[PDB]
């Protein structure tokens, strides 16, 4: 692709009897978090979470903090409205999540924008790819849709995604270029773990890679072993990089028929590995 | 309401070498709702100094968090993470297996 | 930078 993304992820959660709903936001460029805000912080403020954003001046942090405080209030009204749209009790805890942002290509041009919401973990409403129209999941979301149509909300959302979001993403990519534009390839190896006299596990490891997107596959005699491969979810190491493994159970003596194939944007060419007994 | 139970992985930042300082990670993902309690354990006792990442979520709306602490592994010391969530009828303990 | 002036659902 050469492409990049910026995303904001908001979570509001009600907690009847335990105060007003908590609002959390995090911002990402690609797989790198760069800001947070938490309404339960002793002094809620947007805070930097990557080195390259620390250079933004006080006006940045002050503006953004005001935006999140207003957003938290709007989300509290949204949660009240949603409880009513679903005929729900005031006794229960409910969750509103929102995700929005933009994708750009290597030249900085908009590829697409996103602006969508979920209620209790279920898709609720989304801005369509055209940035003009909405898709509502159910008759409750159709209320929101009618209100947002009447107010021409999508126009403001389009303007943000095509203007602000792309312009600030481009700035972040320039300021963070040494890390955000650097792919770190996986360090790979294969381990062997006897299970019984007649079978063993071959585990293909990928360590230390960024971004998180990777493909690890095993082949037997050149045929992909999809149903027989155990994959773990890609996981963060805590130093910006990610880890993953894929395993297969193989008959004793047949190890050399199996190859692990690794694809990652940090690799000029995909890797083929095998178990190397010493 | 539809809930999702956490997936749990316990692992180190760096390949483990006995007596070398590292970080122990407990990655909890795929869960909904977002309230979750995670302890890291050394020989069954709660480690005090544990940090965690800021709450985020995946494309499918499910939440994920990384809990982590510095540790120096040894041959004998046992590490684990213990997770509680509304989907669990008792806390789930996942032991650290340096091979996983 | 986040979006300003969002509307309630």
Numbering used by the authors:
A (entry chain A): 0 to 277
B (entry chain B): 0 to 99
C (entry chain C): 1 to 9
What does the published report state?
The HLAI residues that are polymorphic are mainly those forming the peptide-binding groove, which contains six binding pockets (A to F) that define the size and chemical characteristics of the specific peptide repertoire that can be accommodated by each HLAI molecule. Cognate T-cell receptors (TCRs) expressed on CD8+ T-cells detect pathogen-derived peptides presented by HLAI molecules on the surface of infected cells. In this study we focus on two HIV-1-specific epitopes and their presentation by 4 different members of the HLA-B7 superfamily, HLA-B*07:02, HLA-B*42:01, HLA-B*42:02 and HLA-B*81:01. We show that single polymorphisms between different alleles of the HLA-B7 superfamily can induce a conformational switch in peptide conformation that is associated with differential HLAI-specific escape mutation and immune control.
For example, the dominant HIV-1-specific epitope restricted by two closely-related HLAI molecules within the B7 superfamily, HLA-B*42:01 and HLA-B*81:01, is the same peptide, Gag180–188 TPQDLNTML (TL9-p24). The escape mutation selected in each case differs, with variation most commonly arising at Gag-182 (position-3 in the epitope) in HLA-B*42:01-positive subjects, and at Gag-186 (position-7) in HLA-B*81:01-positive subjects. To explore this notion, we first solved the atomic structures of HLA-B*07:02, HLA-B*42:01 and HLA-B*81:01 with TL9-p24. Although peptide positions 1–4 and 8–9 were in similar orientations in both HLA-B*07:02-TL9, HLA-B*42:01-TL9 and HLA-B*81:01-TL9 structures, residues 5–7 in the HLA-B*81:01-TL9 structure, which differs in the peptide-presentation platform by just 4 and 3 residues compared to HLA-B*07:02 and HLA-B*42:01, respectively, were flipped into the opposite orientation. This ‘conformational switch’ resulted in Leu5 and Thr7 acting as secondary anchor residues in HLA-B*81:01-TL9, as opposed to being solvent exposed in HLA-B*07:02-TL9 and HLA-B*42:01-TL9 complexes. In contrast, the same residue served as a secondary anchor residue in HLA-B*07:02-TL9 and HLA-B*42:01-TL9. HLA-B*07:02 and HLA-B*42:01 have Trp at position 147, whereas HLA-B*81:01 has Leu147. Trp147, in HLA-B*07:02 and HLA-B*42:01, made three van der Waals (VdW) contacts with Thr7 and Met8 in the peptide, compared to just one VdW contact between Leu147 in HLA-B*81:01 and Met8, contributing to the respective peptide conformations. The smaller side chain of Leu156 in HLA-B*81:01 compared to the longer Arg156 in HLA-B*07:02 and Asp156 in HLA-B*42:01, enabled peptide residues Leu5 and Thr7 to form interactions stabilizing Asn6 in the flipped orientation in the HLA-B*81:01 structure. Tyr9 in HLA-B*07:02, HLA-B*42:01 made direct contacts with the primary N-terminal anchor residue (Pro2) in the TL9-p24 peptide.
